[PDB]
């Protein structure tokens, strides 16, 4: 909605949308001759109000006879531009140096598109709002602060991901144990034909996967192969297709799968009766525009990774406080930790029991599944849901 243009004692050219429709009504000549030098103005730069709101008004010189030329901003409100003076000063005092240490060469238009691309990068990076830039500064500094737990869920296609995650969850029954299988370490082998449905289900459910390290994802998009245990090692959700068989030969690997069938509306995974996955994913949710839902899930998984950080780095749990260690004592003491303090119930202890192991493998050597392919599993019987 906001505008950006030039000055001199009149308009030179618009840059935001190049003299667009009724979004731009007010004249630039109202802004012109009032943002120049009525004191007379070496690198002057100032900030007024002029109640739209007056904005950053870096005054520049060309010495050549055409000396008055300042470039000016404008936006909606006051504190967006006053509060962000530090990041509007040092991005126009350096973008002008293409023009300053540009056209200072030719007196003793080559860098014109440089200014008309850098300036578009300035309006594109300051396009959003005042709240969004403050939240992105705070999230930037805090993600600079923590450095271990960021890889687990650090990853606008996230809107299309989270919106299809919400359209997954409130429009598919028994998805609590599927998302439990994703968060627990059980390879969700998504099986079914009609490729694009499976791909959108894969990129929707890709948010919940705790990736191994500081590389991209363990997700696999639409593999077509018998899937012996080497694809179950390197990929934690797989997008197989039906051929009109594979369901019978795939059930031989029933210890490492959760076979979600699209053309049959069944799956095969253990029983989930816990409370963490229903608060990550409630059945009915009055949350609209699922990018908000992706912010909710990212906020919740940050707290989950904080619980896994806590369970990993407590000294009095993992170090045995005895001469000879007894796994009844340390297993019951770990279990007493995840029941009492963390407040987890009967499968969430398995979830945090897994994410802590990924966190150990990242901190110790920065290589799980590449040079240490662990693939921990369990003998819990999977039930055929219908």
């Amino acid at each position: 909605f906001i505008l950006i243009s030039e000055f001199s004692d009149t308009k030179v050219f618009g840059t935001f949308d190049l003299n667009y429709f009724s979004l731009r009504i007010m004249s630039v000549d109202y802004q012109a001759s009032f943002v120049g030098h009525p004191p007379g103005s070496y690198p002057k730069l100032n900030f007024v109000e002029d109640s739209k709101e007056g904005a950053f008004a870096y005054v520049h010189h060309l010495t050549g006879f055409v000396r008055p030329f300042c470039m000016a901003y404008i936006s909606a409100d006051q504190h967006k531009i006053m509060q962000q003076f530090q990041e509007l000063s040092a991005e126009f005092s350096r973008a002008s140096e293409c023009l300053k240490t540009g056209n200072r060469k030719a007196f003793a238009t080559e860098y014109f598109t440089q200014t008309l691309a850098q300036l578009s990068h300035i309006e594109h990076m300051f396009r959003g709002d005042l709240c969004y830039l403050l939240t992105s500064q705070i999230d930037r500094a805090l993600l600079k602060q923590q450095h271990i737990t960021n890889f687990l869920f650090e990853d606008r296609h996230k809107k299309r991901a989270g919106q299809n995650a919400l359209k997954f969850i409130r429009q598919y029954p028994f998805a609590h144990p599927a998302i439990y299988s994703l968060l627990s370490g059980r390879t969700l082998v998504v099986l079914g034909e009609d490729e694009a449905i499976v791909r959108k289900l894969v990129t929707a459910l890709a948010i919940f996967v705790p990736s191994y390290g500081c590389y991209a994802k363990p997700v696999k998009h639409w593999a077509s192969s018998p899937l012996h245990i080497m694809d179950f090692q390197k990929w934690k959700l797989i997008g197989l297709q039906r051929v009109a068989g594979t369901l019978h030969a795939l059930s031989r690997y029933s210890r490492y799968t959760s076979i979600l069938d699209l053309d049959n509306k069944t799956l095969r995974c253990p029983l989930y009766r816990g409370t963490l996955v229903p608060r990550l994913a409630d059945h009915r949710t009055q949350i609209k525009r699922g990018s908000t839902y992706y912010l909710h899930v990212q906020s919740m998984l940050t707290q989950l990774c904080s619980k896994a950080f806590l369970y990993t780095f407590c000294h009095h749990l993992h170090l045995p406080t005895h001469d000879k260690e007894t796994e009844e004592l340390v297993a019951s003491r770990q279990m007493s930790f995840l029941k009492l303090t963390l407040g987890l119930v009967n499968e969430d202890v398995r979830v945090v029991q897994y994410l802590a192991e990924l966190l150990k493998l990242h901190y110790m050597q920065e290589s799980p599944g590449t040079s240490h392919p662990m693939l921990r599993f369990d003998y819990v019987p999977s039930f055929l849901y219908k």
Partner: protein, 385 residues
């Protein structure tokens, strides 16, 4: 036609001038070997004055030629602030205390000239010089090393220090971040001001001020966390006037008695601020205690003191907690922002917001709601008032 003042804790400023249509009076410190004379300040005030040809507008100017940075408000008349180009990041947090601190000077002096002025503005300029003299001397560092705080103490507290440590951080984060800690010594109030300043952004750190052992500071209505100590008699002064003039309410956290007092929420604070400002401009035309506790700060303070102190774990987990606080704030902003059509319809949607966003406790709603107000102003009036 100028006066000179000399104060310990050397000045950051250069002068303070008033406009007529040039100078009428100059308030200057007694900084020995001043870098510049008076005529550049007078003629430079003539630069920043006559360039426009009701409310009170603000002007901000940075001169990289002589090396000054000018802040001024113009109402014909104009008050200006002269401070060098040696610092710019020093002033920029103090903008919202300097602007309103000079704006009420402009209101009362504007009515006082409307009844018809230098001696009625000596006592108005003389605090805001001492504020900037205080901020350079003590305020904070940005790097809060957490080795100096209540964290690392290996134990949260025996009987009452756990409840006071829960209510202090809890009531702090419920009251939009603004606090006042008062005491009779310096080391304890410094420990509570650093401990309580872990939970802020480094921009909001630079507003807040530490304690002072020797001289006399006062309350200010713009600092986030203040460490002003009590008198030798065992008392202090929190004036009812200027506490209302602060943009946010305030916790009166009191060490040595371990009580925690609060103020009403910020919609009633802005509303009663409008009541008291209007009803004090028509002349010649209260700490209500903590409502209820929370769950996130109880969980956090429960499970932090099991990690080790000196191994950089508590700061990591603390940054994770501030990360989930700010992300819950941003998804609360998004959920209000799309519940209505970004401020078209009235809100009417608190209950589903409380059950969906894991915020069924109101005392834990107030923290996320307070941060959401702090980086999106105008929510509490939209949903509560």
């Amino acid at each position: 036609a100028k006066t000179e003042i000399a104060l310990s804790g050397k000045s950051p400023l250069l002068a303070a001038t008033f406009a007529y249509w040039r100078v009428r009076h100059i308030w200057a410190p007694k900084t020995e070997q001043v870098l510049l004379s008076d005529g550049e300040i007078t003629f430079l005030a003539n630069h920043t004055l006559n360039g426009e040809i009701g409310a009170i507008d603000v002007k901000f100017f940075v001169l990289s030629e002589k090396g000054v940075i000018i802040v001024s408000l113009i109402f014909t008349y104009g008050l200006s602030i002269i401070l060098p180009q040696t610092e710019l990041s020093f002033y920029l947090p103090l903008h919202r205390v300097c602007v309103d601190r000079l704006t009420h000077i402009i209101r009362k002096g504007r009515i006082w000239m409307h009844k018809e002025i230098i001696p009625m503005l000596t006592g108005e300029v003389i605090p805001v010089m001492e504020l900037l003299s205080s901020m350079k001397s003590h305020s904070v560092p940005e790097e809060i090393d957490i080795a100096d705080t209540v964290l690392n103490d290996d134990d949260i507290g025996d009987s009452c220090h756990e409840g006071f440590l829960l209510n202090a951080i809890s009531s702090h984060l419920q009251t939009c971040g603004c606090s006042v800690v008062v005491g009779s010594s310096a080391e304890k109030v410094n420990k509570i001001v650093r401990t309580l300043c872990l939970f802020l952004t480094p921009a909001e750190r630079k507003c807040s001020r530490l304690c002072e052992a020797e001289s006399s500071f006062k309350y200010e209505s713009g600092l986030f966390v203040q460490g002003l100590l009590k008198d030798s008699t065992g008392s202090f002064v929190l004036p009812f006037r200027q506490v209302m003039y602060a943009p946010y309410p305030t916790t009166h956290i009191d060490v040595d008695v371990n009580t925690v007092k609060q103020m009403p929420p910020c919609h009633e604070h802005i509303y009663n601020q409008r009541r008291y400002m209007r009803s004090e401009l028509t002349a010649f035309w209260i700490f209500q205690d903590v409502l209820h506790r929370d769950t996130l700060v109880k969980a956090f303070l429960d499970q932090v003191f099991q990690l080790k102190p000196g191994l950089s774990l508590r700061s990591t987990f603390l940054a994770q907690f501030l990360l989930v606080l700010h992300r819950k704030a941003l998804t609360l902003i998004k959920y209000i922002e799309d519940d209505t059509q970004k401020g078209k319809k009235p809100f009417k949607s608190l209950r589903n917001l409380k059950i969906d966003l894991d915020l069924t406790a109101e005392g834990d709603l107030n923290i996320i709601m307070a941060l959401a107000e702090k980086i999106k102003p105008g929510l509490h009036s939209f949903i509560f008032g």
